[PDB]
Amino acid sequence: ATFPPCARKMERADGPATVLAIGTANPPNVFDQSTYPDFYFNITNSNHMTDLKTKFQRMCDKSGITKRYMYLNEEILKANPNMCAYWEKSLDVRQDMVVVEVPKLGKEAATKAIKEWGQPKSKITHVVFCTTSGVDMPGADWALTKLLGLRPSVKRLMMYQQGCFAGGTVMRVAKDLAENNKGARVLVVCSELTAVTFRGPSETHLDSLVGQALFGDGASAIIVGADPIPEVERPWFEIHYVASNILPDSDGAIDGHLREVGLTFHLMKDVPGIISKNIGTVLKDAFEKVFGVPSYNDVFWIAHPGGPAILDQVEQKLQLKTEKMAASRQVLSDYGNMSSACVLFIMDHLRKKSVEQKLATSGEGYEWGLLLGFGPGLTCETVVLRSVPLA
Template identity: 80%
Template sequence: GKIQRMCEKSMITKRYMHLTEEILEENPDICAYMRPSLDARQDMVVVEVPKLGKEAAVRAIKEWGQPKSRITHLVFCTTSGVDMPGADYRLTRLLGLKPSVNRLMLYQQGCFAGGTVLRVAKDLAENNAGARVLVVCSEITAVTFRGPSETHLDSLVGQALFGDGAAAIIVGADPDPALERPLFELLSASQTILPDSEGAIDGHLREVGLTFHLLKDVPGIISKNIQKSLMEAFKPLGIHDWNSIFWIAHPGGPAILDQVEAKLGL
């Protein structure tokens, strides 16, 4: 009943997952709340994370319209599994990128993966003439999926919200107008540690897989600090009216969107 209520409150109507009933039947330890199952999870994600990333990367390269030999850098980010060489290496092989591509592998960025990779790609593009940075994020929830626990209901929140997915984009600082059509301009990318936020969201890689813990007040912590963060980001750009800009917020869940909307009068 509790998980059903959480799923309904999440407002998410459809999610995609690599895990199937067959996989779960073959790996019953993954279905328990705290049973050693890391090997089975790892075996899945080290293969599937780069494969899913490839799907997104192929689309991004096609949309860009340039030969993949022009890609100079690859930034790959995942919170799903750790391996060496990592998913960046596997993706380079899967895509057939040149061996000299400069790779950067980022792990365990969690909810701020997208912002982090764009920030890093912006710096790489602006500081290396002619750079074309392929940025890929890919996640498979097999690393975190687990059965319920009466004493750790916060674990269910993640099960209700998260699904599998990947995204990719090409970032450069000097578009060639004859060949390229930029979709967006990256003006600013930053991050900050919010006061009194320690322990609000954390994850730990254990024998049982990746465990997630979320405090109830995550939406409150965000809404309390959103105004200051936005002012720091947008003041240098001369933007003060939050309703004058187009928003794509990474929500986590609907409570964060609702509280941010109320706080900023959107």
């Protein structure tokens, strides 16, 4: 039924997939969240909606966000009233920005990780590009290859319209890319701009208004590879286990539609409830596969900060000491919800703070840890990591 077998024609690697470098970047315009409602209702000329604006200040005050970064600014928004309206034909100007600027922002981040990695660009064999902001053909992955000058033969994978969970998904993809091909070095970039989703306020769509309070811009990048060249490359985290789950009872919890008015956002279920109701069995299964088992308080946490209530209730139902979501709360506070890019921001922050504080490992002195993606589906991606030992 088969021809005589032959040796693996493309040699695989032997160790686990490993993060060799992380780099991040953000657009230049900073918005303090405490005065965001004044700004938002000005630039959308909706100051007549007094009660709604009061509702919005509530949402921002409780978002857990201190500031956000945006490609958009007051100059750009006044030039584009159709994006300042709530529901106006827009999609073309929105595309015209993001198809250019998300690979640009991904380039900044990619270049920092490449600098930290320190090997020549030519040793990059795969590119994985992930975004929720706009689509084009050829894709941002191709544009990133052009902007960087990688080999024309890099193997590319373009991930469009993914949602907040794909920070976890890119780990699972790069895991197989790096481990099945010997010598592979995977450049992974998540780049997100809210220009597809900024819109004016509407008194009958408060869920859209939550989005306006939570979403910010940012790009994150990592270099993943197996069998790191000792004394030349530097490991920071190891990918050991990956899993994906559509949580029970979550049909229709979050939807997003790309329409003539841009990307629209729709909440219809208790997202933090469903996540914290089901996270225990998700992580129990994972820990059984991986170990046979350490506590939840004795691993490092990298969790996507969908909103504060997600981290709050996961912290509550799993009885985590408040220090566990710290690195995750810290990123949400400095940047808001950057969709897929958040977890690589948390991962970078976690390792840097581990070094500065001279802890035993790169995961706050713990050996094992979790990366968690949350989004539409409701979809949960689970990534069990190992850190590296540190001085």
